[PDB]
């Protein structure tokens, strides 16, 4: 693991005199820590052991340099170095150790380490439980980061092309709309800066007229249509082609059309409840009339078929 060089570039840009001093004193022992601004925290110097900066090991022997090099770090030290390297690339500032991004990357690395350890030796039920708890915490951190920003998501989730993490736990809970209820409960229910992501003028409805958001969009000439898969596009095309097909079919081949019209005309006579009374008008006949569903009628077997 190595530090990104954006830190060196930023330090040289911010402090020209100190950077030039370091460059001119390269290879010479230094009694004053010019790199204090370069290394605000202990975790920000993970190249060498014990948070020793590279510039400090200048007037010392190559034996000491090798002993403090990366090749002499323990497993825990290597894990912490990798964690710090990943965290500093997502932290909003040097001291950012509470943001959901840094929390998520730290928890993800810890989960990876725990999974590797469990693959080696799986007889640690304590490790299994702590891995489950860390996975839960990582899921919560990512759910919280979702609402604050998603550019970080399209930056981080491309790691190994996961694109499927934060999967809903179960269909029974997901159907009742409790998977998205976490955003409501976390206080990030509605915080997206809607105006920047899309035009908010056509995303609402007129109270005075009562027309829906779609009606407002069509009146304003806008179209808020989500990306569509193949099946819905096929359905739309098939339904659109209906009038064009029928207009030519009726003219070209009126025989079959007239036969079907005769059949429908006689079917309307020979049916059930030709009068449009309340019984026939009942949109959900089995649900409305249940007391006669067992002994009077046999057509329906279940009293309800939909959510209502």
């Amino acid at each position: 693991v190595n530090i990104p060089e954006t830190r060196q570039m930023k330090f040289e840009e911010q402090h020209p005199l100190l950077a030039g001093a370091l460059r001119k004193l390269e290879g010479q022992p230094k009694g004053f820590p010019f790199w204090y601004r370069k290394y605000p925290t202990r975790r920000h110097a993970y190249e060498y052991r014990f948070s020793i900066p590279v510039e400090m090991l200048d007037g010392y022997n190559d034996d000491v340099k090798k002993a403090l090099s990366k090749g002499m770090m323990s497993i825990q030290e290597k894990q912490f170095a990798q964690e710090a390297m990943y965290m500093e690339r997502y932290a909003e500032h040097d001291f950012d150790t509470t943001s959901p991004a840094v929390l998520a990357v730290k928890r993800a690395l810890k989960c990876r380490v725990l999974r590797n350890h469990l693959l080696t030796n799986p007889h640690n039920n304590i490790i299994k439980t702590v891995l489950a708890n860390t996975e839960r915490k990582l899921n919560h951190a990512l759910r919280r980061l979702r609402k604050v920003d998603f550019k970080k998501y399209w930056e981080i989730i491309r790691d190994h092309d996961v694109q499927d993490i934060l999967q809903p736990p179960n269909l029974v809970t997901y159907r009742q709309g409790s998977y998205w209820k976490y955003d409501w409960n976390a206080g990030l229910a509605i915080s997206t800066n809607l105006a920047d992501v899309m035009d908010p003028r056509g995303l609402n409805g007129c109270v005075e007229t009562g027309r829906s958001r779609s009606e407002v969009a069509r009146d304003l000439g806008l179209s808020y249509t989500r990306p569509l898969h193949e099946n819905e596009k096929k359905q739309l095309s098939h339904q659109a082609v209906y009038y064009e097909r029928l207009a030519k079919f009726k003219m070209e081949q009126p025989e079959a059309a007239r036969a079907m019209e005769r059949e429908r005309f006689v079917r309307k006579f020979s049916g059930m409840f030709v009068k449009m009374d309340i019984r026939s008008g009942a949109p959900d006949f089995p649900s409305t009339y249940r007391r006669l569903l067992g002994t009077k009628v046999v057509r329906w077997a279940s009293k309800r078929h939909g959510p209502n």
């Binding site: 007889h123 640690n124 039920n125 304590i126 439980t129």
Partner: protein, 53 residues
């Protein structure tokens, strides 16, 4: 000893809290005299916690 039940209950509480709060007053399984030296590969030699199994 049975007039000092509270002290041993505290000991058991400490052990239970240590082992993820699952096993209360449970001890690790007995192992053979040379269990760490005569058991073949793939078998646990050092006894584990009653929760770890």
């Amino acid at each position: 000893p049975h007039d000092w039940r509270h002290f041993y209950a505290q000991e058991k509480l400490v052990r239970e809290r240590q082992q993820n709060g699952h096993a209360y007053g449970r001890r690790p399984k007995q192992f053979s005299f040379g269990a760490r030296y005569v058991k073949t590969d793939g078998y646990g030699k050092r006894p584990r916690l009653p929760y770890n199994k």
